[PDB]
Amino acid sequence: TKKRRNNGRAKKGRGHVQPIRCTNCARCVPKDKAIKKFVIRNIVEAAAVRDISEASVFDAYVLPKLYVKLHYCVSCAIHSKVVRNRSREARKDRTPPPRFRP
Amino acid sequence: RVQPIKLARVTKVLGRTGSQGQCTQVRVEFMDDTSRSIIRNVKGPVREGDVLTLLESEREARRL
Amino acid sequence: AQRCKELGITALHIKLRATGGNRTKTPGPGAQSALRALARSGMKIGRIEDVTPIPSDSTRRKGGRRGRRL
Amino acid sequence: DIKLFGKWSTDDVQINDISLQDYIAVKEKYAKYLPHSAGRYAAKRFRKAQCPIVERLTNSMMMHGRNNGKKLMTVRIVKHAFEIIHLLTGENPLQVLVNAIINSGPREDSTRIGRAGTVRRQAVDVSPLRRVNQAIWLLCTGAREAAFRNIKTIAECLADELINAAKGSSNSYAIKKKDELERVAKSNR
Amino acid sequence: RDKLNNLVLFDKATYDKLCKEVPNYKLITPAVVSERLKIRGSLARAALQELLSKGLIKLVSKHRAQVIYTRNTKG
RNA sequence: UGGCUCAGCGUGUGCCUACCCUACGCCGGCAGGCGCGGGUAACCCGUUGAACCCCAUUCGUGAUGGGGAUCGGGGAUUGCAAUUAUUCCCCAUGAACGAGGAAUUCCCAGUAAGUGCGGGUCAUAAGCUUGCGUUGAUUAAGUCCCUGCCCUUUGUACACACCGCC
Ligand SMILES: [Mg+2]
Ligand SMILES: [Mg+2]
Ligand SMILES: [Mg+2]
Ligand SMILES: [Zn+2]
């Protein structure tokens, strides 16, 4: 049974997509098929900010961040629970999960 | 060279941890510096407001 | 902190580095603790910069195309 | 003032640390004539605090099968032992008890389910309520084990256990296991 | 630590030790004297109440299981 | 070893069916025996004078006055029948056993445990079970780690259903 009309990848008008390596298990996955993370994390912990601010020589010192682009095969993506198997109806939508900002 | 034994006061209970209930994780403020506060996992019954010893300053801090 | 204090150093510019290359770019759990303890031990923190090796395009990553099976 | 066992006024004893001040019941509100009360101390959580600690030691001193209901015998052994420690130290027996309880309760331990090196894996500091409970149990087991196959009786063996615990000489079984638990926790940090 | 082989009956070398140094410390009981002087312990109970009759030792408890004595007050 | 001192369930004379619960007096050291009685029962047993425990004695860290297994002799009761000992008593022996590996059971307040007492079985009888009572705690007010259970999603080549199929 054809599970997804998308065929599990973004390849629509192409014929071949150059592969990447899974950042976790180093598996060759097509670039448009692997699940991509872009995490903009604080360079320090959420509880270490207060300690660093005391020892910062600059009073108005902006906090640098970390820019990491992760790529995952669906094996490592499911194993790390970054994606989950969804119902037949719930599979179709492509909206990202809510950010839980408030 | 050596950090001495101190005490900290529980402010709020965060929840159980250890996948057995053998430990509870609570937030503790420092009596020496009330602004200074960490989160510590403790064993045994803990409720709000009680003060307990802490043999070392920082060991672990994770969010459940 | 003890060696720097006894050699006459009071501030630091922390330069973080992960494994880099084609390997992992996320620093391990030791990054947060070592950085936090340096400031809490009575030492100043200035500019923090990243020197993680980020290739344009690296060589082949070790493991094989089927990955590290586990 | 309440004259526990007919003597040993409870208004002069004091707890030398605030972490256990609110969990020991040597205070005047919980100052009782006799360590014997069926006040339903297991009905709800956080109700063993208001139970008098002299009663708590009496509860924990009956174990090992042959002694599981006998409280008259346990109270009379406590009565003998407190008089004995008074005769051997010259201060209030309750002050000896509070010194022993604080100095016996281990302040850290370790408990995990994953892979363990020696005993457990991760070090976790204990609660004040668990401090007291482990302290009383360790003192009772130390007295019982020393008294199991020697001519010294329970009142005397309980006396030297609490006396060596009040000072601290690595001879009390309670402080001996306390140091072992602290060292294991330090290794498992 | 194999067998106590304690003293069922007194001898001169221990009887004098009972008479001179036993009523000098705070806590004297039949168990303490039995382990200290290596006497049996039935002899300990009898000898302690002999010193009670001589009046140089004060009794406090007098229980069937835990009978407790003490030295006289000094000062 | 002696003294002290407090329970609650419940049973008790029978169609066939014979076989009751026992106060008191006397005899014997005991198991027992003999006569007066009572009770078809909140009426008598029975204020069920239980045990544990408590208070005093002796013992004194030894396989000892712990333990009573095995075994000899003797005496009664029930039954027609007691040997392969029915049960009980007395005097004899005093065996392992010094807290028990891997594992494993049960349990949250009048609970575990200690401790005895009724019923069922019974002419004879409880180490069984079913109920009752006394003394009375430690830890815990959590988790899905182990063993499992429920709901949803999901995959399946399973449907005798994973102890499946292959
Ligand atoms: Mg499929
Ligand atoms: Mg192709
Ligand atoms: Mg796998
Ligand atoms: Zn992967």
XYZ file of C-alpha atoms (C1' of nucleotides) and ligand atoms in Angstrom:
670
model
C 0.000 0.000 0.000
C 1.273 3.445 -0.960
C 1.408 4.960 2.519
C 2.047 8.588 1.541
C 1.343 10.372 -1.726
C 4.415 12.419 -0.787
C 6.344 9.093 -0.885
C 8.098 10.111 2.332
C 10.321 12.671 0.606
C 10.140 16.117 -0.957
C 11.377 14.905 -4.370
C 8.693 16.023 -6.826
C 10.227 17.327 -10.051
C 13.744 16.048 -9.459
C 15.255 12.730 -10.445
C 18.056 12.461 -7.902
C 18.816 14.313 -4.666
C 22.331 14.374 -3.251
C 22.592 12.535 0.086
C 23.598 13.746 3.529
C 24.744 11.856 6.626
C 22.586 11.325 9.693
C 24.100 13.398 12.487
C 23.400 10.593 14.991
C 24.196 7.237 13.356
C 25.992 8.419 10.166
C 23.567 6.819 7.710
C 23.409 8.022 4.109
C 19.937 9.551 3.720
C 18.668 11.689 0.817
C 18.726 15.354 1.765
C 15.027 15.970 1.105
C 14.003 12.787 2.946
C 15.888 13.237 6.224
C 14.137 15.131 9.007
C 15.888 18.462 9.537
C 16.273 20.241 12.869
C 17.472 23.826 13.239
C 18.027 24.449 16.947
C 18.907 27.948 18.117
C 19.983 27.162 21.674
C 21.444 29.420 24.323
C 25.179 28.805 24.678
C 24.623 28.416 28.440
C 22.025 26.612 30.524
C 18.650 28.109 31.379
C 19.826 28.115 35.018
C 23.444 29.202 34.448
C 22.565 32.648 33.044
C 22.332 34.259 36.485
C 25.761 32.982 37.546
C 27.537 34.191 34.398
C 25.932 37.639 34.612
C 27.702 38.263 37.929
C 31.153 37.454 36.524
C 30.627 39.175 33.164
C 33.001 42.116 32.795
C 30.474 43.770 30.465
C 27.379 44.929 32.342
C 25.178 44.921 29.215
C 26.643 41.735 27.755
C 24.414 40.120 25.138
C 24.271 36.335 25.348
C 25.635 34.477 22.297
C 23.683 31.546 20.914
C 24.439 28.253 19.167
C 23.420 27.458 15.584
C 23.265 23.714 14.884
C 21.549 22.103 11.888
C 20.682 18.474 12.628
C 19.782 15.804 10.080
C 18.142 12.521 11.034
C 17.143 9.303 9.371
C 13.644 8.256 10.364
C 15.224 5.545 12.528
C 17.127 8.032 14.688
C 14.304 10.575 14.519
C 11.777 8.087 15.900
C 14.293 6.644 18.373
C 14.920 10.110 19.828
C 11.154 10.852 19.733
C 11.620 14.027 17.688
C 8.868 12.681 15.398
C 6.032 10.282 16.140
C 3.841 7.923 14.157
C 0.460 9.561 13.589
C -2.974 8.280 12.641
C -4.093 7.881 9.037
C -5.945 11.203 9.092
C -3.341 12.987 11.236
C -0.534 12.044 8.830
C -1.693 14.346 6.038
C -1.241 17.773 7.628
C 2.146 19.458 7.290
C 1.856 22.241 9.868
C 4.734 22.264 12.370
C 3.894 21.484 15.996
C 3.107 24.549 18.119
C 6.056 26.358 19.664
C 4.404 26.588 23.123
C 5.636 30.176 23.385
C 3.318 31.434 26.133
C 39.929 24.624 49.099
C 36.967 22.642 50.458
C 33.351 23.806 50.395
C 31.721 23.450 53.834
C 28.378 21.892 54.682
C 25.407 24.241 54.323
C 21.595 24.301 54.366
C 18.863 25.208 51.892
C 15.115 25.770 52.196
C 12.575 24.057 49.944
C 10.343 26.527 48.091
C 8.240 24.362 45.760
C 7.872 20.707 44.786
C 8.444 19.916 41.112
C 7.627 16.208 40.946
C 8.829 12.670 41.475
C 11.872 11.288 39.677
C 13.930 8.121 39.380
C 11.208 6.068 37.607
C 10.353 4.460 40.959
C 9.188 7.312 43.180
C 12.291 6.680 45.300
C 13.219 10.342 44.758
C 11.371 13.650 44.659
C 12.752 16.725 42.903
C 12.223 20.108 44.571
C 13.525 23.653 44.224
C 15.687 24.925 47.089
C 16.597 28.518 47.864
C 19.790 29.238 49.786
C 19.570 30.641 53.303
C 23.008 32.239 52.905
C 21.870 33.973 49.697
C 18.112 33.998 49.098
C 18.610 35.146 45.501
C 20.798 32.072 44.928
C 18.562 29.068 44.258
C 18.981 25.709 42.523
C 16.904 22.570 41.980
C 17.862 19.379 43.810
C 16.550 15.814 43.833
C 16.148 14.346 47.323
C 14.994 11.050 48.798
C 12.490 10.642 51.596
C 9.361 12.694 52.258
C 9.663 16.421 51.532
C 6.999 19.115 51.794
C 7.084 22.867 51.291
C 9.211 25.099 53.489
C 11.435 22.552 55.233
C 15.176 23.222 55.367
C 17.642 20.416 54.660
C 21.405 20.003 54.588
C 23.412 20.040 51.358
C 26.984 18.755 51.423
C 27.918 20.307 48.065
C 26.892 23.376 46.095
C 26.045 22.233 42.553
C 25.588 18.644 41.387
C 22.705 18.320 38.919
C 19.819 20.290 37.431
C 17.348 18.867 34.910
C 13.779 19.695 33.914
C 11.112 16.991 33.823
C 40.578 28.305 38.750
C 43.242 27.451 41.329
C 46.158 27.353 38.884
C 45.134 30.594 37.163
C 44.700 32.328 40.527
C 48.162 31.226 41.663
C 49.673 32.349 38.338
C 48.001 35.770 38.245
C 44.988 35.485 35.933
C 41.605 36.995 36.783
C 39.501 36.894 33.589
C 38.981 34.498 30.696
C 37.725 34.432 27.114
C 35.993 31.064 26.779
C 36.404 29.396 23.376
C 34.024 26.447 23.046
C 34.765 23.624 20.615
C 32.771 20.489 19.836
C 34.220 17.465 18.024
C 33.795 19.223 14.688
C 34.618 18.021 11.214
C 31.994 15.677 9.832
C 31.439 14.483 13.414
C 29.061 15.895 16.024
C 28.793 19.674 16.366
C 26.878 19.607 19.663
C 29.150 20.073 22.701
C 28.695 17.425 25.338
C 27.307 17.781 28.857
C 30.704 18.974 30.107
C 30.301 22.345 28.383
C 27.670 23.734 30.756
C 29.318 22.537 33.967
C 32.872 23.661 33.181
C 31.705 27.070 31.940
C 29.463 27.581 34.982
C 32.125 26.525 37.492
C 34.725 28.916 36.057
C 32.566 31.964 36.780
C 31.324 30.668 40.142
C 34.879 29.953 41.345
C 35.608 33.693 41.394
C 36.825 34.337 37.855
C 35.583 36.791 35.252
C 33.983 35.931 31.910
C 34.432 38.120 28.854
C 33.766 37.148 25.245
C 32.667 33.602 24.403
C 33.410 32.425 20.866
C 33.004 29.159 18.970
C 35.981 27.454 17.324
C 34.178 24.234 16.469
C 35.562 22.963 13.135
C 32.760 23.570 10.636
C 33.917 22.339 7.219
C 32.649 23.696 3.962
C 32.511 20.096 2.770
C 34.481 17.418 4.580
C 35.674 13.944 3.597
C 33.609 10.768 3.923
C 32.266 10.188 7.428
C 33.238 6.947 9.138
C 30.505 4.357 9.578
C 29.310 3.293 6.146
C 26.232 4.280 4.187
C 24.000 2.050 6.329
C 25.183 3.794 9.480
C 26.118 2.498 12.908
C 23.530 -0.213 13.519
C 22.222 -0.443 17.083
C 7.992 20.340 83.246
C 6.075 17.308 82.010
C 8.503 14.991 83.878
C 8.874 12.195 81.345
C 9.154 8.882 83.240
C 8.680 11.021 86.362
C 11.841 13.089 85.828
C 14.033 14.614 83.091
C 12.307 17.922 82.411
C 12.048 18.574 78.676
C 12.449 22.371 78.773
C 16.272 22.345 78.869
C 16.891 20.153 75.809
C 17.471 21.815 72.451
C 18.185 20.876 68.839
C 21.456 22.321 67.534
C 20.308 22.510 63.892
C 17.171 24.074 62.438
C 16.821 21.382 59.757
C 15.702 18.962 62.488
C 14.191 21.460 64.956
C 10.742 21.200 63.347
C 10.780 17.395 62.943
C 11.894 16.267 66.415
C 9.083 16.279 68.987
C 10.955 16.982 72.237
C 9.171 20.327 72.488
C 6.658 21.246 75.180
C 3.651 20.627 72.918
C 4.845 17.035 72.421
C 6.196 16.664 75.964
C 4.582 13.538 77.396
C 4.573 11.804 80.770
C 5.144 8.376 79.228
C 6.250 7.186 75.755
C 3.034 5.284 75.089
C 0.154 6.621 72.994
C -2.137 5.089 70.376
C -2.727 8.415 68.682
C -3.201 6.982 65.170
C 0.190 8.105 63.880
C -0.109 6.206 60.567
C -3.416 7.698 59.398
C -1.857 10.296 57.093
C 1.477 11.452 55.702
C 3.457 14.002 57.750
C 1.864 12.860 61.017
C 4.845 11.002 62.493
C 6.498 14.390 63.057
C 4.025 15.364 65.783
C 4.432 11.894 67.284
C 6.844 12.190 70.245
C 10.318 10.941 69.372
C 10.603 9.059 72.676
C 7.526 7.134 71.551
C 9.082 6.748 68.087
C 12.167 5.036 69.521
C 9.897 2.770 71.575
C 8.005 1.794 68.416
C 11.188 0.976 66.494
C 12.823 -0.981 69.331
C 10.483 -3.991 68.943
C 11.559 -6.151 65.999
C 13.011 -9.535 64.998
C 9.808 -11.502 65.439
C 9.680 -12.359 69.139
C 8.990 -8.679 69.928
C 6.320 -7.285 67.611
C 3.537 -6.212 69.953
C 5.205 -5.989 73.360
C 5.290 -2.286 74.213
C 5.294 -2.612 78.005
C 8.656 -4.379 77.788
C 9.996 -1.790 75.348
C 8.927 1.139 77.532
C 10.557 -0.467 80.575
C 13.793 -1.020 78.622
C 13.741 2.623 77.516
C 13.034 3.637 81.124
C 16.018 1.598 82.307
C 18.264 2.877 79.515
C 17.486 6.584 79.950
C 18.193 6.298 83.672
C 21.420 4.482 82.792
C 22.642 7.141 80.352
C 21.764 9.789 82.945
C 23.908 7.879 85.439
C 26.739 7.637 82.902
C 26.757 11.151 81.388
C 25.239 13.417 84.049
C 22.993 15.404 81.690
C 19.405 15.038 80.520
C 18.741 11.682 78.798
C 16.648 13.500 76.187
C 19.616 15.715 75.300
C 21.584 12.498 74.788
C 18.779 11.247 72.535
C 18.723 14.394 70.385
C 22.513 14.333 70.058
C 22.368 10.671 69.025
C 19.529 11.193 66.528
C 21.251 14.064 64.713
C 24.659 12.371 64.716
C 23.257 9.051 63.432
C 21.021 10.142 60.557
C 22.973 9.922 57.310
C 22.780 13.140 55.320
C 23.295 11.547 51.883
C 22.665 8.245 50.126
C 22.414 6.751 46.636
C 19.653 4.925 44.759
C 19.183 4.124 41.058
C 17.911 1.314 38.818
C 20.476 1.532 36.033
C 23.974 0.105 36.009
C 25.698 0.487 39.378
C 29.420 0.488 40.079
C 29.628 -0.622 43.715
C 26.178 -0.324 45.336
C 24.188 2.326 43.458
C 24.802 4.857 40.674
C 23.769 8.444 41.495
C 24.218 10.360 44.747
C 21.127 11.968 46.271
C 20.966 13.929 49.521
C 18.279 12.779 51.949
C 15.329 14.580 53.543
C 15.199 15.616 57.217
C 12.264 13.255 57.774
C 14.225 10.337 56.314
C 17.186 11.475 58.430
C 15.257 10.824 61.642
C 13.683 7.564 60.453
C 17.023 6.096 59.388
C 18.612 7.384 62.605
C 16.157 5.617 64.918
C 16.292 2.374 62.929
C 20.101 2.384 62.856
C 20.254 2.943 66.619
C 17.770 0.138 67.306
C 19.633 -2.312 65.069
C 22.962 -1.375 66.634
C 21.650 -2.035 70.136
C 19.936 -5.275 69.113
C 22.941 -6.670 67.233
C 25.362 -5.923 70.077
C 22.958 -7.478 72.597
C 22.096 -10.603 70.598
C 24.660 -13.050 71.998
C 26.348 -11.330 74.936
C 25.569 -11.082 78.634
C 24.843 -7.342 78.430
C 21.117 -6.633 78.404
C 19.051 -4.486 76.046
C 18.955 -1.453 78.344
C 22.742 -1.384 78.703
C 23.479 -2.096 75.031
C 21.007 0.593 73.966
C 22.708 2.915 76.449
C 26.236 2.568 75.073
C 24.891 2.740 71.515
C 23.275 6.138 72.097
C 26.180 7.338 74.258
C 28.779 6.475 71.616
C 26.455 8.045 69.040
C 26.082 11.267 71.043
C 29.856 11.716 71.220
C 30.908 10.018 67.988
C 33.716 7.469 68.190
C 33.137 5.229 65.120
C 31.920 2.542 67.545
C 28.189 3.220 67.241
C 26.680 1.020 64.540
C 24.445 3.947 63.580
C 27.333 6.320 62.881
C 29.380 3.483 61.367
C 26.774 2.811 58.694
C 26.247 6.574 58.426
C 29.876 7.099 57.405
C 29.658 4.155 55.005
C 26.575 5.655 53.348
C 28.234 9.069 53.068
C 31.401 7.611 51.535
C 29.393 5.579 49.014
C 27.375 8.678 48.113
C 30.586 10.685 47.693
C 31.961 8.071 45.292
C 28.642 7.971 43.400
C 28.487 11.764 42.956
C 36.427 -15.442 71.112
C 35.632 -19.135 71.573
C 34.415 -19.649 75.163
C 34.150 -17.362 78.177
C 35.094 -19.948 80.877
C 34.080 -17.352 83.460
C 34.539 -17.613 87.227
C 31.688 -19.457 88.935
C 33.294 -18.934 92.360
C 35.615 -16.201 93.565
C 39.341 -16.352 94.182
C 41.553 -13.992 96.166
C 42.996 -12.233 93.103
C 39.518 -11.161 91.934
C 37.643 -10.795 95.235
C 39.943 -7.965 96.301
C 39.473 -6.355 92.874
C 35.736 -6.421 93.565
C 36.267 -4.888 97.004
C 38.485 -1.964 95.951
C 37.767 -0.764 92.393
C 34.254 -1.969 91.490
C 32.361 0.633 93.684
C 34.256 3.515 92.071
C 32.613 4.147 88.673
C 29.200 5.490 87.819
C 27.380 2.473 86.338
C 27.655 -0.914 88.065
C 25.346 -3.738 86.967
C 25.737 -7.538 87.082
C 26.422 -7.585 83.332
C 29.179 -4.961 83.520
C 31.062 -6.594 86.395
C 30.689 -10.043 84.798
C 32.351 -8.941 81.559
C 34.981 -6.820 83.340
C 36.197 -9.253 86.010
C 35.418 -12.357 83.887
C 33.205 -13.719 86.673
C 30.148 -15.791 85.759
C 27.288 -13.367 86.351
C 25.244 -15.313 88.846
C 28.153 -14.633 91.193
C 27.872 -11.029 90.000
C 24.247 -10.678 91.113
C 24.992 -12.234 94.503
C 28.123 -10.160 95.125
C 26.431 -6.893 94.132
C 23.689 -7.366 96.723
C 26.363 -8.332 99.251
C 27.874 -4.893 98.662
C 24.347 -3.503 98.962
C 24.162 -4.963 102.473
C 27.570 -3.466 103.264
C 26.076 -0.130 102.195
C 28.903 1.078 99.944
C 26.751 0.721 96.794
C 23.379 2.366 96.109
C 20.576 0.624 94.210
C 18.202 2.583 91.958
C 16.001 0.321 89.817
C 15.595 -3.225 91.262
C 13.965 -4.965 88.320
C 13.783 -8.707 87.695
C 15.618 -8.177 84.386
C 17.542 -4.895 84.784
C 18.773 -4.259 88.331
C 21.023 -1.199 88.436
C 23.489 -0.033 91.081
C 25.859 2.905 91.446
C 28.821 4.140 93.440
C 28.288 6.308 96.491
C 28.186 10.071 96.075
C 31.545 11.823 96.440
C 31.626 15.434 97.605
C 9.470 -21.071 89.309
C 5.771 -18.338 92.152
C 2.318 -14.387 92.493
C -0.686 -10.686 90.073
C -4.368 -9.532 86.419
C -7.797 -8.207 82.004
C -11.386 -10.787 76.266
C -14.863 -11.771 72.197
C -16.999 -14.815 68.345
C -19.525 -19.410 69.304
C -21.187 -24.323 70.942
C -23.675 -27.668 74.149
C -28.498 -33.984 75.282
C -29.536 -36.398 68.761
C -36.346 -38.726 63.811
C -33.483 -42.306 61.674
C -28.663 -42.046 65.087
C -26.187 -45.103 69.426
C -22.427 -40.205 70.081
C -24.215 -33.789 74.688
C -21.847 -28.903 77.486
C -20.453 -29.526 82.444
C -20.737 -26.518 88.030
C -19.816 -29.091 93.065
C -18.048 -33.042 96.726
C -14.631 -37.130 97.496
C -10.284 -40.592 95.866
C -5.315 -40.472 93.221
C 0.736 -37.155 92.036
C -1.007 -36.964 86.895
C -3.650 -38.567 82.895
C -8.330 -40.221 85.369
C -12.499 -42.339 88.479
C -17.114 -42.293 91.676
C -22.239 -39.345 93.242
C -24.962 -35.393 93.488
C -26.842 -31.797 90.273
C -27.747 -27.652 86.365
C -28.569 -26.437 81.347
C -32.900 -27.751 74.894
C -29.720 -22.211 77.300
C -28.661 -13.289 78.020
C -31.728 -18.550 82.874
C -26.567 -23.665 83.616
C -21.411 -24.272 82.009
C -19.827 -18.787 82.911
C -18.448 -12.467 86.033
C -16.207 -18.060 79.963
C -10.835 -15.986 86.464
C -7.574 -17.631 78.181
C -2.857 -16.779 76.480
C 0.508 -13.102 75.831
C 1.972 -9.583 78.965
C 3.182 -7.616 84.208
C 5.731 -8.180 89.010
C 9.559 -11.088 91.968
C 13.279 -16.032 91.840
C 16.951 -18.990 89.574
C 19.949 -19.485 85.309
C 24.569 -16.688 82.816
C 26.836 -16.632 76.548
C 28.613 -23.430 76.801
C 24.498 -26.797 71.696
C 23.762 -24.529 78.942
C 18.267 -24.803 82.902
C 17.944 -22.869 74.888
C 15.572 -27.116 71.579
C 12.611 -31.600 72.272
C 13.712 -34.614 67.610
C 14.554 -40.070 68.212
C 13.838 -43.987 71.664
C 12.779 -47.608 76.655
C 9.614 -48.700 80.585
C 4.996 -47.900 83.122
C -0.380 -46.045 83.811
C -5.543 -44.393 82.042
C -9.359 -42.957 78.785
C -12.618 -43.774 73.623
C -13.935 -47.994 70.810
C -15.789 -54.598 69.427
C -10.828 -54.010 67.876
C -5.197 -49.239 69.787
C 0.214 -53.897 66.834
C 2.128 -50.338 61.820
C 2.600 -47.172 68.505
C -5.557 -43.461 68.314
C -5.288 -39.844 72.220
C -3.412 -38.245 77.116
C -0.026 -38.578 81.593
C 4.718 -39.894 84.406
C 9.844 -41.207 84.844
C 13.988 -42.077 81.393
C 17.790 -40.158 76.094
C 18.857 -35.209 74.811
C 19.653 -35.218 67.849
C 20.121 -31.436 64.475
C 19.534 -26.351 64.869
C 24.328 -20.514 66.535
C 19.515 -16.887 61.887
C 20.018 -20.239 56.701
C 22.872 -19.722 49.049
C 20.404 -18.954 44.359
C 15.787 -17.412 44.623
C 10.920 -16.456 46.602
C 5.854 -15.151 49.608
C 2.588 -11.580 51.897
C 1.520 -6.596 53.476
C -0.549 -0.002 54.649
C -3.914 0.956 60.563
C -6.358 -1.668 64.866
C -2.695 -3.780 59.202
C 1.902 -7.260 59.720
C 3.631 -9.844 63.635
C 3.338 -12.037 68.782
C -0.522 -14.493 71.448
C -4.165 -17.728 72.889
C -9.965 -19.208 72.458
C -14.469 -21.249 69.858
C -16.646 -23.827 65.187
C -15.895 -27.745 61.003
C -13.669 -32.540 61.028
C -14.793 -35.967 66.048
C -16.782 -42.512 69.658
C -10.831 -40.708 69.992
C -8.690 -36.179 68.600
C -5.615 -30.470 65.255
C 0.624 -28.854 63.542
C -5.329 -28.020 58.899
C -9.012 -24.558 57.945
C -12.804 -21.178 59.296
C -14.040 -17.098 62.767
C -12.983 -14.346 67.568
C -10.130 -11.664 71.094
C -5.411 -9.342 73.523
C -0.550 -6.367 72.613
C 0.563 -3.383 68.579
C 4.422 -0.946 65.208
C 8.634 0.483 61.045
C 8.499 2.258 56.337
C 5.281 4.448 51.932
C 0.536 8.615 50.359
C 4.861 7.261 44.809
C 6.524 4.940 40.093
C 6.052 2.099 35.581
C 12.376 0.074 36.509
C 10.780 -5.646 36.990
C 5.992 -8.668 36.715
C 1.445 -7.579 34.734
C -3.670 -4.784 33.459
C -6.839 -0.747 30.753
C -7.633 3.232 26.832
C -5.817 5.615 22.077
C -2.446 5.570 17.959
C 0.612 2.426 15.116
C 2.960 -2.152 12.314
C 1.968 -7.160 11.274
C 3.240 -12.373 6.594
C -0.306 -13.577 13.700
C -6.308 -15.571 13.840
C -4.973 -23.010 17.137
C -3.941 -15.503 17.662
C 4.061 -14.704 19.655
C 3.786 -20.797 23.846
C 2.083 -17.404 16.500
C 4.304 -17.835 12.027
C 8.532 -19.047 9.445
Mg 3.284 -1.786 5.314
Mg 16.588 7.116 -9.545
Mg 17.647 0.065 16.761
Zn 20.421 7.851 12.152
